[PDB]
Amino acid sequence: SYDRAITVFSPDGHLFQVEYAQEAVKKGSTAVGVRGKDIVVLGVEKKSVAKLQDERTVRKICALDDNVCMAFAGLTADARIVINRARVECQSHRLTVEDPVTVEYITRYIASLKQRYTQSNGR
Amino acid sequence: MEYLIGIQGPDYVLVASDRVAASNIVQMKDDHDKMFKMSEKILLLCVGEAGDTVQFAEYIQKNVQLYKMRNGYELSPTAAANFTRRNLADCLRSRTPYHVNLLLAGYDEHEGPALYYMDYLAALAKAPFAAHGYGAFLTLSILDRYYTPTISRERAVELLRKCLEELQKRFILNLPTFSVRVIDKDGIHNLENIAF
Amino acid sequence: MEYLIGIQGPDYVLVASDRVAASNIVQMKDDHDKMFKMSEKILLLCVGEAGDTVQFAEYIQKNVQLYKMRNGYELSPTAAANFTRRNLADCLRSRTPYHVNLLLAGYDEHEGPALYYMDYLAALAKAPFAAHGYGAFLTLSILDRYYTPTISRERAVELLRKCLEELQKRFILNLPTFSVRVIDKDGIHNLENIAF
Amino acid sequence: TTIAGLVFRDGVILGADTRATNDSVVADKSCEKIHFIAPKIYCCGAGVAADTEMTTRMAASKMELHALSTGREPRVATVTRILRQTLFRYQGHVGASLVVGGVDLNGPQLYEVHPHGSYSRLPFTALGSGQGAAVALLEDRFQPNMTLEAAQELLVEAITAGILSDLGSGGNVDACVITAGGAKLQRALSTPTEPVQRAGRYRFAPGTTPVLTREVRPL
Amino acid sequence: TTIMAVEFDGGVVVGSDSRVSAGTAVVNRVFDKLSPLHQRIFCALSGSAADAQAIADMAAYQLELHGLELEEPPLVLAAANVVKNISYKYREDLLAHLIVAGWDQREGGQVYGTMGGMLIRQPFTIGGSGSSYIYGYVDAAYKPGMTPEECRRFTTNAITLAMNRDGSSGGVIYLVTITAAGVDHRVILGDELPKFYDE
Amino acid sequence: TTIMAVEFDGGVVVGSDSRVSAGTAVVNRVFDKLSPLHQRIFCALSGSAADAQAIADMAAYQLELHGLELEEPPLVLAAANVVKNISYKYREDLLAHLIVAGWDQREGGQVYGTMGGMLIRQPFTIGGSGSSYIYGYVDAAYKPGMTPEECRRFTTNAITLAMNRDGSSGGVIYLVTITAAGVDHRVILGDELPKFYDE
Amino acid sequence: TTTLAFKFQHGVIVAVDSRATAGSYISSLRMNKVIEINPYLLGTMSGCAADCQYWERLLAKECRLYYLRNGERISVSAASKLLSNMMLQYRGMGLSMGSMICGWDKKGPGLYYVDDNGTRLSGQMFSTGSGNTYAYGVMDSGYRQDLSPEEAYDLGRRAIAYATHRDNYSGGVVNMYHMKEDGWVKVESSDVSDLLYKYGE
Amino acid sequence: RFSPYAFNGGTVLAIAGEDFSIVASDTRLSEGFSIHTRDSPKCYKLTDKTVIGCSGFHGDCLTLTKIIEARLKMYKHSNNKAMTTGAIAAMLSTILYSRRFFPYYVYNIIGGLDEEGKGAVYSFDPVGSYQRDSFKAGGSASAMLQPLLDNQVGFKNMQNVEHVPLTLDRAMRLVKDVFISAAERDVYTGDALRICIVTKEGIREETVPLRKD
Amino acid sequence: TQNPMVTGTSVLGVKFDGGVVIAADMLGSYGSLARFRNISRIMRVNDSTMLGASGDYADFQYLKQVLGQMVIDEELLGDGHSYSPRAIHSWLTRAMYSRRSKMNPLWNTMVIGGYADGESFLGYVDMLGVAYEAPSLATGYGAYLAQPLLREVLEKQPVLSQTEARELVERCMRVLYYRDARSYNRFQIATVTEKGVEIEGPLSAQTNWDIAHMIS
Amino acid sequence: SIMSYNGGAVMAMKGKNCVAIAADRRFGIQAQMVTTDFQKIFPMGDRLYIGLAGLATDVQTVAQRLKFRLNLYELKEGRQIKPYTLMSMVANLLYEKRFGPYYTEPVIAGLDPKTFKPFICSLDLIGCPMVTDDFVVSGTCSEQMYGMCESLWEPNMDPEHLFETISQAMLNAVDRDAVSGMGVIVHVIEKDKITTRTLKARMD
Ligand SMILES: [Cl-]
Ligand SMILES: [Cl-]
Ligand SMILES: [Cl-]
Ligand SMILES: [Cl-]
Ligand SMILES: [Cl-]
Ligand SMILES: [Cl-]
Ligand SMILES: [Cl-]
Ligand SMILES: [Cl-]
Ligand SMILES: [K+]
Ligand SMILES: [K+]
Ligand SMILES: [K+]
């Protein structure tokens, strides 16, 4: 197995690999979410589809569970993994516990997954 | 010992299951549901070992739901039934096998109404009508007698009535209440529970 | 698996038995009588092995009848019960033992109402109330709860009602009909059969 | 159960313990394992207690009958054979291992007989659960033509060995001495353990026990 | 148990060991397994102690009566047959091999093996648990026409070796010699016992 | 199977029989059970044929390497230890007794028994099913300081007697003699075989 | 053992016996068969005592971890489900536990039955143990959702006491609990034999 | 085949008071019908506040006591304090259950003091089910010791006894009496009786001779 | 080991004033058959402790090399520390229980004699992990035959001289040879003292067979 | 166990010119109890009683078959039976079924007719007699009864104190047995009178 520390601390106290990943999201498509009183609404942009491309495939709004959905920005290839890992966790939370997933729990899982990838070897 | 039954029509699938949750010699529940919602048009009815049934049924249920989330569309009744068959057959020659007898009922937008029978050994067979449990030995002949592939929903419930009445008269076990549901074009509809 | 029950009052004995003749998984009869007339005031209710019950019950029945012919008077409930106990106990350490669980109810002109409980091992015990079968596990507590030695016949049938309703609700086996008879000063009286 | 037999110059001596165990619990702390057969013949019983008792009493009864018809002092060799054939008939189902010793016109004799019907004749033997301990002592300290007093002491020592070393052996040691002049049965010859003493008095003032029902029949 | 019988011109030699054992414990280290059926007939005991003693007693009884009816000392063949018959009638019920050897006027000193309820006459026979370890010895150490003393050495030797090898065999060696003149009974104590390779 | 190893001053003698049997049927009446671990080390095979052959091969392999690393002919003790170790590591899995005998400069001719995964050195050893019947023979027929030829007689005799008694032993006798000079391998055919009491 | 739980208008009540047995001998007669996970969570014990204690306490640990992480406490449904999965991990291994999970949550009063097999059910009434048949008998006859706390306590006592009378492996004292919107309250710990004499009159 | 267990006998008893705890046992170690040793006390010091009594398979008892001894050190290095009577009882439960499918054939009873200074007794089964109680007996003669304690200490089956609180003097005599009665009937009980008394001062041991047959 | 092959019978032990004495016959039995009548069942661990072993001989020889290496390893350090008789007993208890718990036991019953710090040591180790200390020890059939003799002498006289312990042991080997079918009349005597471990050569107990004539 | 099927507990004690005998009143099959008023102590005459513990059928059978032989004895002989003679009669009755025995262990307790002398004994299921000067116990809680009797019994007890001792011994031993209880019946036997008492035992 590949055992090399990818993300390490810098002399000034910075995690460059994490900061470069934050440069990748800043290059990503514009995504906005806003909570209302009765409903919640997401909105994604910077689509720039060549009109020669089927836009049904490149949709940046994904449903994780019956009551949970998400929008992303940055490396669209990376998103697919996180989305599908969250979708598996949605059904695992439904298997281990009778209750459906709370919005905070899914967010906590996605956050813990992203955190693990900053402190693990080889990735 | 539990009971399952399915009757497929020209454009619908009628399914029924007993509502008894039994332990040794006592009836713990009068209103236990043995049906599992997989999709908007798929139902899985499970019977067998006490702890093995629910764990297995929910595992498949959550994976069919996982497919819906990952793709935006639901599995076909055939693809769903073949998925449940694969999972059971792979556990057959293992240290812990699942002793579950199940019945999958569904409606496809292309193929139409479907009813699948499956062993605890994981042998899959499509049938116009099927029944699980010891009550099947008393009811499959009645089904053989009055079944036509062009049976109406009105007659199907009446045919189910004839089968459930036989379980009250001849079958040694007490099964007073049954869950009855119909799957078609519009989906799953909860129908009046048959009590005796 | 069958069911017997007896309730003794101050001047009467109420007895009830199920009317199911079961084979493997089917109910062959809805109206089978498990009561045996020994004398004008003696009833023997038998339960157990399929062929052993009737053969044993009738053998004792015919010997109690033989005593009546040879002497001009009938055996007392106690002497009858001790006779059945002797015959079963002597076959216990033999090549062919009888696996029969029985309940003897009678009325003596001197001692009064009597109710006897007996094992397949042939242990005899006099009880104010007793029950045989798996249903006894569900009903003996109800009997313990509401029984008083000064219970009236009107309340006794109502107490029996409470016990038989428990068998419909909790007991896994289907026992819909019961034979109900009362023994007193005037003899054996056939009472309305309790159906569900 | 520890039982032993010893042959000395003037006669024989038999020993036994007094412990009878039911399951792994002690039922009798004072039972007689030395059995009357003839005035000058005694038998020690180990095995199933009921079997040893009844087999012994049977032999004793037959021996009395024999003596009555014969009119002569019974032979120990006769007792041994009776026992064997009866025991052999039952194929070891009568759990009686016995030490039989007596005095004859033919002298003092010690036999051991097994529940299956085998017998053997010898100067000294030990049977039962504690036989190992008893045989050890006899093997260690047995000389032929021992004086009675030395024989008395050795037998006691042999049986004592079984009492302490074995769990199914306990109580007092009983000895029976058989000489041409007489047979002296000494119950409780030696008692290794005496605990009469209790520290607490568990007495109850009348009325402590709650009574629902009282009935008295005068005579 | 190791038992042996050897045949010579004047009569026979019957040998035994002294031990009976219950599993791993010995219950009698001094047991005479040589029982007389008659004045001139002896048998060697092996197998179940109870069964062997029971057969020995009956054989002696029947032969005693047989002798009186004929008013002649029983033939050894006759003796051997009664033992064979009892052993065979109850082969499943009785566990014993008895070697019967003795002397009669008609045929002299003779040796018979009754193991399993069969009848065979041999120049010499061995029986018991101990016999297994001496099969080789006896085959190499046997010569025809050995004198009484040569026969005694032979049986003593064989049994000694068996005793040392076998856990179920031990004690002292019991020896009898049957001749027209009478019965000679001798015992060999451990100190007297022959010595060979021990280690 | 009957196997034997005897020790003398110049070296050792290892003996075997020729038969392998499957129950009551013999599958090979001509089998050499004498396998060489090394130039001057031999072993005698008993037990499961497959297991015995499997151990023999591994022992020869390890000792071959052992020899090369030391650049000296392996000690017999060393040879015996490897066999003991393999037998002990898998006592439940492997059913074999191997007798290892040979010659080395340091301690001369030596005989080792590895039955059950133990190590013992003996003036001589026997193994196999046939050994039971010759325990008596060997104890009486053994003398210290027998010459090579005396040793050959001894092992041949013992095995011959065992072969005749034992159903699982038969065929011809295979003999090897290990000395400082070399290995002498000879076979004794039925006609050459020693004669004793047969009936 | 004998264990019962039922719910009515005023909440859920739980009653158990106090007897422990090894074969035919009585190890304990003071045995506590109720585990107080939380102020509003309750668990009963039947089957193998060690199996009940360990696992239900392990559930209790996980209920505690749940409360710390989200700071909201745990639903009864979720709690019972967790326990079910633990037994599901150890299948075919001969673990023996029959238990009920009691609580009050957002859904309301909660009662569940959990099994060593992994069986999980929700219901108005449950009884587990060697004497559950007797408990069911008295419970079923004399039960209505329209009960007063005093009447419910009567039924709990009554059920257990009669069960102990008939059953060899049930006896000792009746431990009763009441589950209220706020939390559980321990009603009583009354000797069964004394109750039975009182009922005898 | 091969059995991993042997029955070695031995009975252990514990009683709790207001400021004391008593752990008592016989000194007999046996196997089958033979006695291994007459000098084998089952009581063992863990701390100045807690004493353990093990009975059953001695092989398990020796290994289990050594595990507890090591776990007591592991705790005090990590927590900077001695393990409390209740904490040892809670720990023993988990150690016994970790062998659910290959159990210690062992009957443990813990006797000591709680954090308030009051007497505490914890009774265990071979698998790890435990609770606190006033008095408990465990082992081969536990059925002989129990009923007398139920009557005297628990005041059971008595009508007008004024319910006198348990003293050390009375409990000591109770401990002696039941073991003298048990030694008369149980074959595995005898030789000598060792009593360990847990108080605020510490552990004190006392020996009273028993039947040696 | 599931089924033992070559086995050794009872091993004796009793401690006198200023040391301990151990006895074991030189027999290795294959079932009932006496296979090897000149094999040592006793070893010298170091200069303070000794060991005699019953049961499977292959398992004894394995434990002989493991203990042998442990003493070698300790002597190499030369730090002024050595294994005490109690330490060997403690290790052996842990070794036997560990093998027992893995359901693959070493089929052995051990007697460990030792002398250290002016005190005599005698320890018992079973194949299941049963361990204790006693003034006198006897395994197998010795526990039924020789142990009753030792206890009865030690009751009347707790302290023995080396001569008294030797003649008691020789008396016990006499009883063992008479009553054990799996015994032999060739035995060794090992002794620990202030001077160390001393194992004496092939010994034979004096036997008397005069009771062979007392059956008529 | 076969004895464990029905359960039961029978105990006898000795005192100053008096004897006491007690038994539990339970009749039950393994899991459940059937009768609260089951009889286990049977009178074999005035001042002589037998208690029977074990299988309920054999308890009743032996009692009936012993009465058969007792009445014939009391008719052939012109006397009432001596306690030693009854012991030997039960011993013979039980041993006759050596290889097919009644599963009951009887307890004889009574005073000798004419000679006043107290007598207590217990027997095997195959009829082995045990005579003691203190107490004898039989049943499923043998160990529990032994533990009480050894601690409670005293050499010379008056009828008042003997009843209290034999009761407390039965009460607490039964409360530790799962297959014995539902009341305890005590008979105190004197020359002048016989006192019969049912005790306030645990009904669980
Ligand atoms: Cl006789
Ligand atoms: Cl005693
Ligand atoms: Cl033979
Ligand atoms: Cl050899
Ligand atoms: Cl071999
Ligand atoms: Cl409690
Ligand atoms: Cl640990
Ligand atoms: Cl370990
Ligand atoms: K859900
Ligand atoms: K031959
Ligand atoms: K919480």
Ordered structural domains, chain H, with CATH: 1-213 (3.60.20.10)
Q: How far is C49 from chain B (nearest CA, A)?
A: 17
Element (H, E) at B191: strand B188-195
In whole angstroms, what is the distance from residue C60 CA to residue C52 CA? 13
Interface of C with J (CB under 8 A): 85, 89, 92-93, 117, 119, 121-127, 130, 136-137, 140
Burial bucket for residue H67 (CB in 10 Å: 0-12, 13-18, 19+)? middle
CATH of the domain at I28: 3.60.20.10
CATH of the domain at B155: 3.60.20.10
Element (H, E) at I30: strand I28-30
Domain of residue I211: give its range.
1-216
Q: Please provide the distance, in angstroms rounded to a whole number, between the alpha carbons at the two ends of chain H.
A: 33
Q: Which residue(s) pair with F44 in the sheet?
A: F34, F99
Going by C-alpha positions, the residue among H181, J109, J122 that lies closest to residue D49 is J122
Instruction: Name the burial class of residue C162, with classes exposed (0-12), middle (13-18) and buried (19+) by CB atoms within 10 angstroms of its CB.
Output: middle
Look up the domain containing C164 and give its range: 1-196
**CA of F129, nearest ligand number:** 5
Q: Identify which of F136, F157, F161 has the shortest CB distance to residue E133.
A: F136
**Tokens encoding I69:** 């290496």
Q: Specify whether the CB–CB gap between F159 and F2 falls below 8 A.
A: yes
Q: Do B54 and G92 touch (CB under 8 A)?
A: no
Q: How far apart are CA I149 and CA D162, in angstroms?
A: 10
Residue in F123, F135, F199 nearest the CB of E133: F135
Q: Annotate I161-209 with DSSP letters as a single string.
A: -HHHHHHHHHHHHHHHHHHBTT--S-EEEEEE-SS-EEEEEEE------
Give the nearest partner residue to C139 out of G137, G158, G165, using CB atoms: G137
Domain chopping of chain E, boundaries: 1-199
Q: Which residues contact H81 (CB under 8 A, 6 or more apart)?
A: none
E121 contacts E22 by C-beta, under 8 angstroms: no
What are B129's two structure tokens?
Answer: 């009508």
Domain count, chain C: 1
Closest listed residue to residue G165, CA positions, set G126, G141, G131, G201: G131
How far from each other are the two terminal CA atoms of chain F, in whole angstroms? 22
What is the rounded CA–CA span in Å between residue I162 and residue I164? 5
Domain count, chain I: 1
CA distance C191 to C181: 5
Q: Does J30 touch chain C (CB under 8 A)?
A: no
Q: Which residues fall within 8 angstroms of residue B66, CB to CB, at 6 or more apart?
A: A87, A88, A90, A91
Contacts with A91 (C-beta within 8 Å, 6 or more apart), sequence order: B62, B63, B65, B66, B69
Q: Is G141 helix (H, G, I), strand (E, B) or coil?
A: coil
Task: Note the ligand closest to the C-alpha atom of H96.
Answer: 7
Q: Which two tokens stand for residue A112?
A: 């813990």
Sheet of E96-104, strand order:
E34-36, E41-47, E96-104, E108-113, E120-121
For residue D132, is it left (φ>0), alpha (ψ between -120 and 50) or beta?
A: alpha
Instruction: Judge contact between J53 and J138, C-beta under 8 A.
Output: yes
Buried-state track E104-129, b at ≥16 Cβ within 10 A, e below 16: beeebbbbbbbbebebeebebbbbbb
Neighbours of C40 (CB within 10 A): 13
Task: List CB contacts (< 8 A) between D114 and chain E.
Answer: 49-50
Strands E25-28 and D20-22: unpaired
Q: Do chains D and F touch (3 or more CB pairs under 8 A)?
A: no
What chain J holds in terms of domains, given with CATH numbers, is: 1-204 (3.60.20.10)
Q: Is A120 exposed, middle or buried (0-12, 13-18, 19+ CB in 10 A)?
A: exposed
Tokens 């029947």 correspond to E62
Q: Say which residue the tokens 């040569």 belong to.
A: E150
How was this model experimentally determined?
Answer: X-ray
Angle at I174 between CA I173 and CA I179, to 5 degrees: 95
Helix axis angle, D131-141 to D148-165, nearest 10°: 150
Phi, psi for residue A74 in degrees, rounded to 5? 115, -140
Q: Which of G32, G30, G34 minimizes the C-alpha distance to G44?
A: G34
User: How many of the other CB atoms lie within 10 Å of CB of C23?
Assistant: 10
Kindly report the backbone phi and psi dihedral angles of residue E113, in degrees, each rounded to the nearest multiple of 5, phi listed first. -110, 130
Cα–Cα distance between E27 and E25 in angstroms, integer?
6
Whole-angstrom Cα distance, residue F9 to residue F148?
A: 8
Q: Do chains H and E touch (3 or more CB pairs under 8 A)?
A: no
How far is it, in rounded angstroms, from Cα B194 to Cα F47?
73
Tell the burial category of E151 from Cβ atoms under 10 Å away from its Cβ (0-12, 13-18, 19+).
Answer: buried
CA–CA separation, F1 and F21 (whole Å) = 9
Cβ separation of G70 and A96 shorter than 8 Å?
no
For ligand 1, the distance from its centroid to the CA atom of residue D104, given in whole angstroms, is 19
Chain-centre distance for alpha carbon D214 = 46
User: How many whole angstroms from I9 Cα to the centroid of ligand 4?
Assistant: 20
Crossing angle, helix G76-89 and helix A76-96, to 10 degrees? 90
Q: Tokens representing D117?
A: 């019907």
With both helix axes pointing from N to C terminus, report the angle between C50-71 and C77-90 in degrees, rounded to the nearest 10: 130
- Name chain G contacts of C167, Cβ cutoff 8 Å: none
Can you tell me the distance from the alpha carbon of H140 to that of H123, in angstroms, rounded to the nearest whole number?
15
Smallest CA–CA distance, residue J18 to chain C, in Å, is: 31
CA distance linking residue B149 with residue B156, whole number of Å: 11
Counts for chain D of helices (H) and strands (E), in that order? 4, 13
Q: What is the dihedral of CA C36, C39, C41, C46, to 10 degrees?
A: -20
Distance CA H51, CA A20 (A): 62
DSSP state of D77: H
Q: Which residues of H28-37 are buried (b: 16+ CB within 10 A; e: fewer)?
A: bbbbebbbbb
- The rounded distance, in Å, linking the Cα atoms of J116 and H170 is 39
> CA torsion sign, G99 to G105 to G109 to G110?
negative
Residues of B in contact with G91 (CB under 8 A): 51-52, 96
Burial (CB < 10 A; 0-12, 13-18, 19+), residue H44, is middle
Centroid of ligand 6 to alpha carbon of I179 (angstroms): 57
CA distance J172 to E48: 52
Distance (Å, rounded) from C-alpha E3 to C-alpha E15? 6
Contact B69 A95 (CB under 8 A): no
Residue I94: closest CA among chain H residues belongs to which residue?
Answer: H63
Q: For the CA atoms of chain D, what is the radius of gyration?
A: 20
Cβ atoms of residues J5 and J55 within 8 Å:
yes
The pair of structure tokens assigned to B111 is 């193929």
Instruction: Establish if E53 touches chain D: CB-CB under 8 angstroms.
Output: yes
Measured in whole angstroms, the distance separating CA C71 from the mean position of its chain's CA atoms is 26
Ramachandran bin of F71, using left for φ above 0, alpha for ψ from -120 to 50, beta for the remaining angles: left
Beta bridge mates, I180: E25
Residue with token string 């040794």 = B24
Count other Cβ atoms within 10 Å, centred on residue D216: 12
User: How many alpha carbons lie under 13 Å from residue E6 in its C-beta half-sphere?
Assistant: 27
CA distance, residue D201 to nearest chain I CA (Å):
34
Encode chain H in three state secondary structure: CCCCCCCCCCEEEEEECCCCEEEEEECCEEECCEEEECCCCCEEECCCCEEEEEEECHHHHHHHHHHHHHHHHHHHHHHCCCCCHHHHHHHHHHHHHCCCCCCCCEEEEEEEECCCCCEEEEEECCCCCEEEECEEEEECCHHHHHHHHHHHCCCCCCCCCCCCCCCHHHHHHHHHHHHHHHHHHECCCCCEEEEEEECCCCEEEEEEECCCC
Q: Across the beta sheet with F108-113, what order do the strands follow?
A: F34-36, F41-47, F96-104, F108-113, F120-121
Q: Residue B185 corresponds to which tokens in the numbers above?
A: 């074009």
Which residues lie below 8 Å from residue E69, measured CB to CB, with a gap of 6+?
A: none
CATH fold of D1-219 = Glutamine Phosphoribosylpyrophosphate, subunit 1, domain 1 (3.60.20)
How would you label A63-86 residue by residue, b for 16+ Cβ within 10 Å and e otherwise? Answer: bbbeebebbbbbeeeebeebbeeb
- CA–CA min distance D150, chain H (Å): 25
SS3 state of residue I122:
strand
Within 10 angstroms of residue B93's Cβ, the number of other Cβ atoms is: 7
Question: What is the Cα–Cα distance from I140 to I134, expressed in whole angstroms?
Answer: 16
Q: Crossing angle of helices A76-96/B50-71, nearest 10°?
A: 160
Instruction: Please tell me whether residue J85 adopts helix, strand or coil conformation.
Output: helix
Evaluate whether C134 touches C2 at the Cβ level (below 8 Å). no
The two three-digit tokens of residue I134, written as one number:
């006693």
Q: I62 — contact with chain F (CB < 8 Å)?
A: yes
Both tokens assigned to J135: 């107490």
Label the pairing between strands J104-111 and I11-16: unpaired
Question: How many other CB atoms sit within 10 Å of the CB of residue A56?
Answer: 7
Q: If you count them, how many residues does chain H have? A: 213
Please give the torsion angle defined by the CA atoms of residues F93, F99, F102 and F107, in that order, rounded to the nearest 10 degrees: 90
Q: Which of C27, C170, C172 sits opposite B169 (nearest CB)?
A: C27
User: Coil, helix or strand for B145?
Assistant: helix
Q: Report the chain D residue with the minimal C-alpha distance to residue J155.
A: D196
Separation of CA E153 and ligand 10 centre (Å): 16
Task: Answer whether E133's CB lies under 8 Å from F135's CB.
Answer: yes
User: In this structure, what token pair is assigned to residue E161?
Assistant: 């070796």
Tokens at residue E163, please? Answer: 């005793």
State the pairing for strand pair F96-104/F41-47.
antiparallel
Q: How far is it between the farthest Cα atoms of chain A?
A: 50
- Compute the distance from residue E46 Cα to the ligand 10 centre, in Å: 15
CATH of domain F1-199: 3.60.20.10
Q: Which ligand is nearest to the CA of F140?
A: 4
- Collapsed DSSP state (helix, strand, coil) of residue J9: strand
- In whole angstroms, what is the distance from residue J179 CA to residue J9 CA? 9
Q: What is the residue whose two structure tokens read 């004699």?
A: I113
D61 touches chain E (CB under 8 A): no
Residues paired with I56 in a beta bridge: I7
Q: Two tokens at J120?
A: 């207590």
- In J47-131 the beta strands, taken as DSSP E runs, fall at 48-54, 104-111, 118-123, 129-131
Q: Which residues of J90-103 are buried (b: 16+ CB within 10 A; e: fewer)?
A: bbebbbeebeebbb
Classify D132 as helix, strand or coil.
helix
- Compute the nearest-CA separation of B35 from chain A (Å): 16
Annotated active-site residue F155? The verdict is no
How far is A93 from A68, CA to CA, in rounded Å?
13
Q: Confirm if I23 and I52 have CB atoms less than 8 A apart.
A: yes
Beta strands, E only, chain D:
2-7, 11-16, 20-22, 25-28, 34-38, 41-47, 96-104, 107-113, 119-121, 124-128, 173-179, 183-190, 211-218
Phi, psi of G6 (to 5 degrees): -145, 160
I186: tokens are 């060739």
Q: Which ligand is nearest to the CA of D81?
A: 1
Identity of the amino acid at G125: M
Give partners of D (≥3 CB pairs < 8 A): E, H, I, J
Most G CBs within 10 Å, among H95, H98, H105, H129, to test the G interface = H129
Cα–chain center distance at F59: 15
Q: Which two tokens stand for residue E125?
A: 């026979």
| Cα of A93 from ligand 9 centre, angstroms | 9
Structure-block tokens of residue B33:
């549901």
Q: How far is CA J109 from CA C21, J43, J46, J122, in A?
A: 50, 10, 12, 9
What is residue B39's DSSP assignment?
S
Tell me the three state secondary structure of residue G74: coil
Cα–Cα distances in angstroms (integers) from residue J17 to residues D217, J20, J49, J158, in the given order:
17, 11, 16, 8
3-state secondary structure of E106: coil
φ, ψ of residue A118 in degrees (nearest 5): -100, -15
